[PDB]
Each structure stands twice: as structure tokens, then as C-alpha cells.
Amino acid sequence: KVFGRCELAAAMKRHGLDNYRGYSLGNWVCAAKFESNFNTQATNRNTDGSTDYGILQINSRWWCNDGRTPGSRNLCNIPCSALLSSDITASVNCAKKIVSDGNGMNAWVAWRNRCKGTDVQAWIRGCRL
Numbered sequence: 682k683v684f685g686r687c688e689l690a691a692a693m694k695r696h697g698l699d700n701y702r703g704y705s706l707g708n709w710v711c712a713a714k715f716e717s718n719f720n721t722q723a724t725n726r727n728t729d730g731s732t733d734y735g736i737l738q739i740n741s742r743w744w745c746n747d748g749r750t751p752g753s754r755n756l757c758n759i760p761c762s763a764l765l766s767s768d769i770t771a772s773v774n775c776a777k778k779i780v781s782d783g784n785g786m787n788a789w790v791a792w793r794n795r796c797k798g799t800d801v802q803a804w805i806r807g808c809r810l
Contacts, residue, residue, distance in 0.1 A: 687808035707801035715791035
């Protein structure tokens with residue numbers, strides 16, 4: 682599913698992401714834009730052989746099992762394909778474990794490079810929330 686900016690904002694909000702760990706809604710929406718262009722089906726393989734899955738591009742090295750990443754830890758306890766669904770619930774639950782982990786949203790490279798320190802509030806402007 683390719684979400685619309687506001688539709689995703691509203692879903693993430695409903696899923697408890699606004700201000701989750703002190704990160705405002707606009708951060709989460711900004712990160713999804715840059716990570717997957719709002720497409721839940723986005724996948725991208727890495728040089729280490731791991732693969733990033735879904736709207737938030739969650740890595741198979743630590744967070745989910747894809748059966749082909751030797752040494753994967755499966756911290757969110759889910760198959761990576763679950764992260765590609767139109768229903769963003771599993772991506773959000775897994776992201777909440779990730780962001781709690783220590784480096785916060787810095788775990789997301791696009792967030793750090795493209796979102797961090799920008800007027801992220803722009804991402805939820807005009808939305809009915």
C-alpha cells in the first residue's frame with residue numbers, strides 16, 4: 682500500500698507513535714517518507730546481506746527473520762514479510778522496540794540525514810488529526 686502523507690500520520694497517531702519516546706509525529710512521518718516513500722512494500726538489500734523491509738525499512742540483521750540473514754537476532758520476533766503489510770501495526774510495534782534501544786531515531790539513517798534538525802512539523806501540516 683502506498684500511503685498518503687496525512688493518512689499515514691493519522692494511522693501512526695492512532696498506533697501510539699506521536700511523542701513516543703519524545704519524538705513528535707512529524708519525525709515518524711518524515712522518516713517513512715525518506716525510508717520507503719510511504720510504500721509498505723519497499724525492500725532494499727544491503728551489502729552485509731541483510732535486507733530492510735517496509736515503511737520504516739526495518740533491518741533483517743537484528744529485528745526480523747527473513748531466512749536468509751545468517752546471524753540474524755529476530756528481536757521483534759516476527760517474519761520480515763509481516764513488515765510489508767497494508768496494516769502498519771507490526772512495523773510500528775517493532776519500531777517502538779528499536780527507538781527504545783539506545784540511539785533513538787538515529788537508528789534510521791534517512792531520519793538522521795534528512796529529518797533530524799529540520800522543521801518536521803511540516804510533515805503533518807494540514808492534516809486532520
